[PDB]
Amino acid sequence: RWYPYIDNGGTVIGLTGKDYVILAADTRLSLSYSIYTRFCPKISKLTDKCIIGSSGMQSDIKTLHSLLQKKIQLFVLEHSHYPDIHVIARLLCVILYSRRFFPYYAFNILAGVDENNKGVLYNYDSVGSYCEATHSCVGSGSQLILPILDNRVEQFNLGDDINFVKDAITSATERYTGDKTLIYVIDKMGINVNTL
Amino acid sequence: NYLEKLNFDFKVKDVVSIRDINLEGKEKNIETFHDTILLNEEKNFLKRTGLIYGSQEVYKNILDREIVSLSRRLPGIKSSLLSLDIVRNTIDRIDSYEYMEKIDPLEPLSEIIEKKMNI
Amino acid sequence: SYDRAITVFSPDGHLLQVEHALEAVKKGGCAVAIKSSNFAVLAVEKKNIPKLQNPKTTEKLIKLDEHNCLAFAGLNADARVLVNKTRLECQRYYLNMDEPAPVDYIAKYVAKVQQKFTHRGGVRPFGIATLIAGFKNNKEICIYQTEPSGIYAAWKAQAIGKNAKIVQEFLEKNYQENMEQKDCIFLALKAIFEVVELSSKNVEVALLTEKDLTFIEEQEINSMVELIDQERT
Amino acid sequence: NLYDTDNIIYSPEGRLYQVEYASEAIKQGTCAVAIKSKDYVVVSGLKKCISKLSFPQEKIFKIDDYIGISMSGITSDAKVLTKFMQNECLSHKFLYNENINIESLVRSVADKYQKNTQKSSKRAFGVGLMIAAYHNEPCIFETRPNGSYFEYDALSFGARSHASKTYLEKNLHLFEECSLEELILHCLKALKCSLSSELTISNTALAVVGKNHPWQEISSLQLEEYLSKVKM
Amino acid sequence: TLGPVVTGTSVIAIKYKHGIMIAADRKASYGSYAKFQNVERIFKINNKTVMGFSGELADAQYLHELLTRKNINNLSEKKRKEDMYTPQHYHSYVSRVFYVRKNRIDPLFNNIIIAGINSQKYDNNDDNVLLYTEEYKEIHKDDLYIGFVDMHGTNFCDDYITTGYARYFALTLLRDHYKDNMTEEEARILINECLRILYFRDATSSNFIQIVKVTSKGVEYEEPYILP
Amino acid sequence: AGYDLSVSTFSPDGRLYQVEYIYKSINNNNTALCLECKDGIICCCINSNMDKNKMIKKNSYNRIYHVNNNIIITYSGFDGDARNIIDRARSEANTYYYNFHTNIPLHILVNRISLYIHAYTLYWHMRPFAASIIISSFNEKDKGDIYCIEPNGACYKYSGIVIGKNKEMFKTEIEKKDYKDINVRDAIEDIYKFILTSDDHMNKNNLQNLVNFSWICKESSYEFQNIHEEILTPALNKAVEYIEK
Amino acid sequence: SFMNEIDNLINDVENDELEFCVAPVNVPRNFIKYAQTQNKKLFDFHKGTTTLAFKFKDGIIVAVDSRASSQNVEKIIEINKNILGTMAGGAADCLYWEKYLGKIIKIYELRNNEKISVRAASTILSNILYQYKGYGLCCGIILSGYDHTGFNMFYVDDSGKKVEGNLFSCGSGSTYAYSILDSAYDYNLNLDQAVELARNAIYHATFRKVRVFHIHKNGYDKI
Amino acid sequence: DRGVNTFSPEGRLFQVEYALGAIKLGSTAVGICVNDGVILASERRISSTLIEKDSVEKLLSIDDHIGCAMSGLMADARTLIDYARVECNHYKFIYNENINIKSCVELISELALDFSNLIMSRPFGVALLIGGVDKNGPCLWYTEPSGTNTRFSAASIGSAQEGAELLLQENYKKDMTFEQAEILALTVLRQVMEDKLSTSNVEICAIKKSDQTFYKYNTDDISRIIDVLPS
Amino acid sequence: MYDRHLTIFSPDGNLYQIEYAIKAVKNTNITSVGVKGENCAVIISQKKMATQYISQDKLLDYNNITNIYNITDEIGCSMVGMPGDCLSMVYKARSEASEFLYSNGYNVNAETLCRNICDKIQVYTQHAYMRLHACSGMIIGIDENNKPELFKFDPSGFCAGYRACVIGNKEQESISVLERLLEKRKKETIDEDIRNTTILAIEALQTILAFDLKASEIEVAIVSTKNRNFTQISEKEIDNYLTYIA
């Protein structure tokens, strides 16, 4: 009589671009009410132009990120080239479906920039059915953050998109959203971590 | 992890048997407990021996049991396995797996040799 | 022995065990097969003791499935075991497709099994060289011919067994394309009797059509062997 | 003569034969030389070339950050061992989130050498490897076909190994506390002495690892510059 | 494995200039009996490492045995002093063990804290480790380390970490009064504050306090003392 | 003559030739001294065959390992078999403290290792272990104890034992005086004298590079610890000065 | 090694991608269902959009809307150069088994040099779907394409179903699509009238961005 | 006499050397790894006129972007190609991108050398010549039974390969276009064919850079490239 | 060929591996005598290292050298043979005793232990896979009826009852000698027969081995109804018996 699943919180927002992707997220953790810390890194770096961010329970997302990094390093060492974001997406899908009857409590978002200089963001679910989403978010804030994204993106430079992401996440905190934000951005010359 | 491993074998439906409802999850019911009725007891015995005496005793016991069990007839005709009974010290004991019987149907003898020892 | 390489490479790059299987095949009985249009006559040498032995039990032109059929030369028990394996495999394939098994798939499977017995420990090579005849999924008659080494190749008119080379040369010299049923049966009978004594009791020829494997009656065989005896002189 | 039929039989003098033949197989391999300093370990070596049409067979394999090795024997054994240490390093960095001790990896592979040379129906590996690393200090290791691992300041495998061993022993004191360029020059001179046949960009396999510099094969231009430097 | 029977109350761990200070209360409540009041809560895996718990005693003792054998394996294959694993390694080991037990549906009823120092540039006592029986050196917060492992394997790093009933209300006092690089007197006063509110605002708590320090000298077991 | 080609097969006159092949192999391998003292024990490992190899790092190749930081284990045979037996000793101590919580008594460990080494000398396909392992420990109340399993699987309690090349000469040298009263700090000089005299390969320069040590005595609180070079060097100088005269 | 195995046995201290893990609960087959009693946020999988496939004189029309959380998810997978598979119900299950069926078909086409039949692919997919029936599996697929025995529109589901026909539609609101199709449908229909009928029926289905593809004897177009 | 795994006095496996003795007996095959692609060819050694010449083909497709040529024992080589394509499509399943040629030949090599316990019993006496295009251009590979795989600019396998490799060394040049590669391969073949170079007595498969498809040349294409040869 | 290598019947019978194992037991020349009295059972052996490649040295605690061992608490044993094989057979007898005590709920009997060890050695002899244990035991024990029992087996596996026996070199003529001592026993409190059996066993070893047998080269143990626990008699008491005999 012990359910091995709990909601730890997370509001990983996503936004693509012409040649950039903005996978911002929070750095706050809480069991149900009380907060564990105020700085919990969750955005795990996969490759120099690809990252992953999720709002699931901390143990499953950390194990999944570490396993994906191990598989990517094995792929790099045995093949001597970085995997593509499509390859990483298919690997993540197969990994997630490998545990289908005992699924990961992890809503992944795989962000990156293709070799053809095109930002792509892939939203995921528990089992693995993913989609190429121009704007997406997961977790508790997904009810409140998505319609702003449809209003804005669906209806521009990277600065305006970064400012819109900052305004949206701060509005979400005003509306377990978080207290500090890490605005990751993947330009044409690698990732640039921007604490906020 | 579990449930075998997919390998694009392409032979999923056989003309000898049908898949079980649980496949290989092996849900805990009375038949599952009775399946692991002898493996668990010998696990306890090897635990006792290699704990108190040293793991070399468990090593010698397992190699002797595999060697005497390796000395048996081919699949088909039932093997007496007397030497295994002497080594495991079950010749003095008569138990439920000795008496009773299971009658067993669709597999040719050559498929049984392929299944038993991987040819 | 269990987990022991019975067949291994020799100093001159040859598998001596597979070679021994090859002359074991050559010491076996003869068997001829012809193809034309949409049918394939098949013949095997019959060897029975008169007045004591039962010809009915001695069967060589078995049918594997609805369409494919198999003849063999060499070890009979090995042939029976591989026949059981191939029939079970044909029913497995017909379960997954719900369509009849083509000749090419079962020929490749026979080649795979005969290769496996030449590459696994504790198994000797199969001492037979079976040749399969049947229709593909395209519904075109074709014949394949496996060996103990596992090599297979499509054939138009091939023979096996004792004195195989003489029958192969005769068929290569005399074979025509798009022949009649009587012509095909006559050619098969002449081909097997080139290396077999001319008698009705030493042949059990049957014709494979899309309906079935029809065994030729004894009277037709008697008439044809008498005709061949007349033509010889 | 009669006791070499299996790898579980000792001669009247108490000595294996299959293990010695594996050592001879290592001796038949091509040359490779590595030299350490205070905080830098170069690992160079030749690259086998069967014919003029064939490009050279790559020797160096990177196992992990600050971990790369050179084969001097059978290629399949090298591939299997490289895969095993790759899996071990990635598993250690996965579960514990830290770099693996080089001593632990060397002991683990030497343990596998022990298991595979102990039981019958098995053969010892016909390859020796330079398990070199910078786990907070430059180290070069060597696992033999018999279960055993050794550590040196410099090393050579097979071919004209005597010339490289003589040169390294002669100039062993300059190797400690020297610049990276001097270490590269000395190692390439040792490989040139091993050739006794001239060093080129294709057949040379210069690789550098150490402080603020993970394992990465040097580019063609810098390699050409170094081979010009040793030539004059 | 089935459920909690013999459980502790809380343990408070903080950092300061010379090292970590962590304090239990030496209580093992048998549901509603309070049988024992002298249980050894905070263990010591080796030098510069301490593993506290708050939960079932059997799971914590099993983890203590596992970590002890990991340390003995480490010492058995030791050449340099730097070969000793840091607290991060032990913390990741405990996290992986809890995750594996979570997968098996055999959860370990504990809330672990792993604390210590992840470097050896200050002390030099690990070249000559003695298992069976000067002045304090300042240590930067970067070289210090403390972690957490939950029921579900959730883990993180922070300056101050609490388990059990302390996680609700004592964390507020710690966030209010914590400062970087405190003196031992002020740190002990903060510990006394945390444990007196734990004693007053809980039933299964206690006042027979344990204190243990993890500094450049090593692990120091201060004597038991009753709260004021 | 056929019977000698397998360890399992018995010779006609009741002596397994393979076992004496192990004995010859170990006797033609690196030596290993060890003995007891009033303060504690001292085990020494000398690597003479490395004299040709002028490549080894300074004192990096150590043949003396430890279990639980309480027990010393050393050897003279092949490295891999000895390391396997060492890891078996570590595993035995592991299982003992897991399932009983008390440190393994030494007689338990040496008995289990003795039957483990013997457990390979009654089958046909596994290579027999080629290693003669010396286990040792010292307690204040119990004084000292040094065991030595032979490759056959024969464990005996020794006050002092030497195995390898020139083992007879070293055992003759140790028996000149009773070493029970000689302290551990002073016996290093005598050990240096014996290895410099008995062994021909060891010259004056090689004494510091290719030699290993560890005690268990009261100075280290009866626990494992290697000799610091500041302790070895005066003993080396005194031994060289004495032998030079 | 055997040593480590026995050591782990006495001490009582004991993962390829294609291997499927299961719960240690008493009945793993109902495990997800038990978890659905506890919560539903995790078990909110991306469901597929209703699909409408039908034969006509020249080829086959296959139309499907884009509505998942998402509204631009492709609902048709390329099983083969002539076989196009649909997606309905649980997106992950049908997607993964469509890809795995395509890999089986590629292996069969490689070793056995012949184009596979639509009946064969439908039978294989139904067999593997039935292999994991009872564990919990939601998937609605409409195999459709050409083979040497003419065109074929085989329909398969999680429960091992295999029904041949000429008119099919699966997903949410499939009964409305069936009603409109029975109201208006003819085998001897033009391509323009056929795609107009498909668009009208799909628009009726998702009312109470459509994507349509035309499969022909030499492959399939994207219009 | 001896087991399947026993080192010789010269540190060479006896069974590996015997496997290398068997690969010489076989049909000629030639390949040129020019920048435009790979032109892996074969012999079509016809046993007799009664051979159907449809089921006996030496050039098989491990994948759409991979070509190969078989030599030595033929059923064993078919097993190698079957395992290679199985793991290639497995790689396609796990990873979206098509499998590189290098990784495929590693899978082939670790298939070949698994006969030692380090199940299969004896070594695979086959000498394949894998070739195909991937993201870094064309790549041509080789795997003798000893497992020392190595890439080639141009290579030949089968019986009487000495003349083929000598002529390839004496004619091959860098920056050779695809038609030049075709005529070079046909000239090398005709200068190692015992019989005349007819249209039906040769098999060629091409994996072009732009197309990246396994196109086995038909009768008309073979006839054209035979006709365009020099005197 | 290879008839004498494996446990093969060979021409005209005479399984030769068993004879080679028996000869290997004989080559160790550690004579060990066992004698059965009345409500007592003395087992006596020699504290000497088995003959092998190595040799005894002054730096060796001679008390640790021993051939007499305890199975569980009441049933003792004395293996003479190879070093590893003797203690391995001791551990196998311990395992059989543990099996009996765990399953049947009471202490094992000497007869049942001897038959079980005989069956295990039978499995070793019949199977040529594994080498035969060259170690002949000598088991003593008190039965449930409070009577002594002497027993012995060999590498052949011939478990049989005895009243006085010896294992090791020169075991042929010694069969007569013990009988003569039983003749002296043919012509009393518990301690009286205990002392008589002890001095008779010591005299038997003295007559067989034929030297003084100083107190630091004898290990004596007795199981009687007064005590019933296998305990080794001290050195001083052995010296007292030796002086009393002389």
PDB file of N, CA and C in Angstrom, chain G residues 52-56 59-63 144 153 190-199 212-215 223:
ATOM      1  N   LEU G  52     -10.404   8.146 -41.529  1.00  0.00           N
ATOM      2  CA  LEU G  52     -11.407   7.730 -42.507  1.00  0.00           C
ATOM      3  C   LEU G  52     -10.673   7.246 -43.750  1.00  0.00           C
ATOM      4  N   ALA G  53     -10.789   5.948 -44.046  1.00  0.00           N
ATOM      5  CA  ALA G  53     -10.116   5.315 -45.174  1.00  0.00           C
ATOM      6  C   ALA G  53     -11.127   4.533 -46.000  1.00  0.00           C
ATOM      7  N   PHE G  54     -11.023   4.633 -47.328  1.00  0.00           N
ATOM      8  CA  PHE G  54     -11.944   3.893 -48.187  1.00  0.00           C
ATOM      9  C   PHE G  54     -11.372   3.726 -49.589  1.00  0.00           C
ATOM     10  N   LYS G  55     -11.750   2.613 -50.217  1.00  0.00           N
ATOM     11  CA  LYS G  55     -11.401   2.306 -51.595  1.00  0.00           C
ATOM     12  C   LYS G  55     -12.295   3.071 -52.566  1.00  0.00           C
ATOM     13  N   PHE G  56     -11.825   3.179 -53.805  1.00  0.00           N
ATOM     14  CA  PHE G  56     -12.651   3.628 -54.921  1.00  0.00           C
ATOM     15  C   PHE G  56     -11.996   3.119 -56.205  1.00  0.00           C
ATOM     16  N   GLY G  59      -7.979   4.271 -56.747  1.00  0.00           N
ATOM     17  CA  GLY G  59      -7.107   3.940 -55.636  1.00  0.00           C
ATOM     18  C   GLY G  59      -7.817   3.939 -54.299  1.00  0.00           C
ATOM     19  N   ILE G  60      -7.137   4.438 -53.265  1.00  0.00           N
ATOM     20  CA  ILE G  60      -7.662   4.507 -51.904  1.00  0.00           C
ATOM     21  C   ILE G  60      -7.451   5.922 -51.389  1.00  0.00           C
ATOM     22  N   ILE G  61      -8.470   6.465 -50.719  1.00  0.00           N
ATOM     23  CA  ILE G  61      -8.382   7.743 -50.016  1.00  0.00           C
ATOM     24  C   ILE G  61      -8.213   7.437 -48.539  1.00  0.00           C
ATOM     25  N   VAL G  62      -7.319   8.176 -47.875  1.00  0.00           N
ATOM     26  CA  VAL G  62      -7.111   8.068 -46.430  1.00  0.00           C
ATOM     27  C   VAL G  62      -6.993   9.491 -45.894  1.00  0.00           C
ATOM     28  N   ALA G  63      -7.983   9.922 -45.108  1.00  0.00           N
ATOM     29  CA  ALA G  63      -8.047  11.252 -44.517  1.00  0.00           C
ATOM     30  C   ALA G  63      -8.014  11.143 -43.000  1.00  0.00           C
ATOM     31  N   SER G 144      -3.931  -0.207 -45.200  1.00  0.00           N
ATOM     32  CA  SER G 144      -4.522   0.078 -46.500  1.00  0.00           C
ATOM     33  C   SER G 144      -3.415   0.174 -47.536  1.00  0.00           C
ATOM     34  N   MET G 153      -7.772  -3.297 -47.571  1.00  0.00           N
ATOM     35  CA  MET G 153      -8.114  -2.277 -46.547  1.00  0.00           C
ATOM     36  C   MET G 153      -8.254  -2.998 -45.198  1.00  0.00           C
ATOM     37  N   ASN G 190     -15.151   9.622 -58.680  1.00  0.00           N
ATOM     38  CA  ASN G 190     -13.965  10.312 -59.160  1.00  0.00           C
ATOM     39  C   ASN G 190     -13.044  10.662 -57.994  1.00  0.00           C
ATOM     40  N   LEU G 191     -11.789  10.973 -58.330  1.00  0.00           N
ATOM     41  CA  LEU G 191     -10.816  11.343 -57.306  1.00  0.00           C
ATOM     42  C   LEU G 191     -11.214  12.641 -56.612  1.00  0.00           C
ATOM     43  N   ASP G 192     -11.691  13.624 -57.382  1.00  0.00           N
ATOM     44  CA  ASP G 192     -12.088  14.900 -56.788  1.00  0.00           C
ATOM     45  C   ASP G 192     -13.318  14.728 -55.905  1.00  0.00           C
ATOM     46  N   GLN G 193     -14.313  13.980 -56.385  1.00  0.00           N
ATOM     47  CA  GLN G 193     -15.493  13.706 -55.573  1.00  0.00           C
ATOM     48  C   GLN G 193     -15.133  12.881 -54.345  1.00  0.00           C
ATOM     49  N   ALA G 194     -14.186  11.950 -54.487  1.00  0.00           N
ATOM     50  CA  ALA G 194     -13.795  11.110 -53.359  1.00  0.00           C
ATOM     51  C   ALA G 194     -13.105  11.926 -52.270  1.00  0.00           C
ATOM     52  N   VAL G 195     -12.157  12.790 -52.650  1.00  0.00           N
ATOM     53  CA  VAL G 195     -11.477  13.597 -51.637  1.00  0.00           C
ATOM     54  C   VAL G 195     -12.436  14.625 -51.043  1.00  0.00           C
ATOM     55  N   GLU G 196     -13.379  15.146 -51.839  1.00  0.00           N
ATOM     56  CA  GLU G 196     -14.390  16.045 -51.288  1.00  0.00           C
ATOM     57  C   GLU G 196     -15.269  15.331 -50.267  1.00  0.00           C
ATOM     58  N   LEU G 197     -15.671  14.092 -50.569  1.00  0.00           N
ATOM     59  CA  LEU G 197     -16.448  13.296 -49.624  1.00  0.00           C
ATOM     60  C   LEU G 197     -15.664  13.039 -48.345  1.00  0.00           C
ATOM     61  N   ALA G 198     -14.374  12.711 -48.479  1.00  0.00           N
ATOM     62  CA  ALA G 198     -13.542  12.469 -47.305  1.00  0.00           C
ATOM     63  C   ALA G 198     -13.414  13.722 -46.448  1.00  0.00           C
ATOM     64  N   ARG G 199     -13.189  14.876 -47.084  1.00  0.00           N
ATOM     65  CA  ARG G 199     -13.068  16.127 -46.338  1.00  0.00           C
ATOM     66  C   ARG G 199     -14.374  16.481 -45.637  1.00  0.00           C
ATOM     67  N   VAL G 212      -5.101  14.543 -46.115  1.00  0.00           N
ATOM     68  CA  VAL G 212      -5.619  13.450 -46.932  1.00  0.00           C
ATOM     69  C   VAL G 212      -4.538  12.995 -47.900  1.00  0.00           C
ATOM     70  N   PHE G 213      -4.468  11.679 -48.114  1.00  0.00           N
ATOM     71  CA  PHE G 213      -3.499  11.038 -48.991  1.00  0.00           C
ATOM     72  C   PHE G 213      -4.210  10.054 -49.907  1.00  0.00           C
ATOM     73  N   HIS G 214      -3.732   9.986 -51.151  1.00  0.00           N
ATOM     74  CA  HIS G 214      -4.261   9.106 -52.189  1.00  0.00           C
ATOM     75  C   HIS G 214      -3.228   8.024 -52.480  1.00  0.00           C
ATOM     76  N   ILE G 215      -3.584   6.779 -52.166  1.00  0.00           N
ATOM     77  CA  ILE G 215      -2.745   5.615 -52.430  1.00  0.00           C
ATOM     78  C   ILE G 215      -3.142   5.045 -53.784  1.00  0.00           C
ATOM     79  N   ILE G 223      -1.489  15.265 -51.150  1.00  0.00           N
ATOM     80  CA  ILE G 223      -2.267  16.396 -51.659  1.00  0.00           C
ATOM     81  C   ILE G 223      -2.779  17.261 -50.508  1.00  0.00           C
TER      82      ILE G 223
END
